[PDB]
Homo-oligomer: A and B are copies of this chain.
Amino acid sequence: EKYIVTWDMLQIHARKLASRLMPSEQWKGIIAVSRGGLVPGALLARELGIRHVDTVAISSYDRELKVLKRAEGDGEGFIVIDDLVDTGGTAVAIREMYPKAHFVTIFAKPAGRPLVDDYVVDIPQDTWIEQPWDMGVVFVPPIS
C-alpha cells in the first residue's frame, strides 16, 4: 500500500509535533537531516521561532555511511529531525553523532519507533510513504 502525504497534511503533523516541543526556550537550534528533514525542520523552526537551523548530510555506499556534511557539537540543546523512521539504519548513526540531541520525526514505522524520542504518525512497516516533494499536481485521465 502507498500512503499519500500532501503539503497540507504534512504541515498539520509538523504543527502537532511543534506543540510538544514547547517551551521554545529549552532549545538552541534545529539540526535537519538532509534531505528528508529539511522541510519538516523548516516548519518547526518557524512554529518555534528558531533561527539557528543547521543540517547533516549522510550518503550510502554499497552498507557503509558517508557523512558528507556534519553539524558541530554533540547535539545538546538541539532538535534533530528527519521526515520518517523506517528501520533505524540512519537513525542509529544520527544517535551516536548527537547523543544528547532530541531526535524527532513525523512518521515512524514499527521497527524504527523505539529509536526516536518522539514522532507524530504511525505507519505500517509495509507501507510506502509518498512525501509531497516527490509529487505534483498534474492531469489525471477519467476512469470512464
Contacts and interface: CB of A to CB of B under 8 A. Distances in A.
A19 B142 CA distance: 10
Contacts of A135: 137-140
A34 B51 contact: yes
A58 to B, nearest CB: 8
Interface stretch (A2-10, A98-106, A110-118): A2-10
Identical subunits present: 4
Contacts of A48: 142-144
Interface in A39-77: 39, 41-43, 45-49, 51-55, 57-59, 68-69
Contacts of A42: 35, 38-39, 42, 133
23 contacts: A4-B137, A6-B7, A7-B8, A11-B136, A12-B136, A23-B144, A24-B144, A35-B45, A35-B46, A38-B38, A38-B41, A39-B39, A42-B133, A46-B134, A47-B142, A47-B144, A48-B143, A54-B54, A54-B55, A135-B139, A136-B138, A136-B140, A138-B138
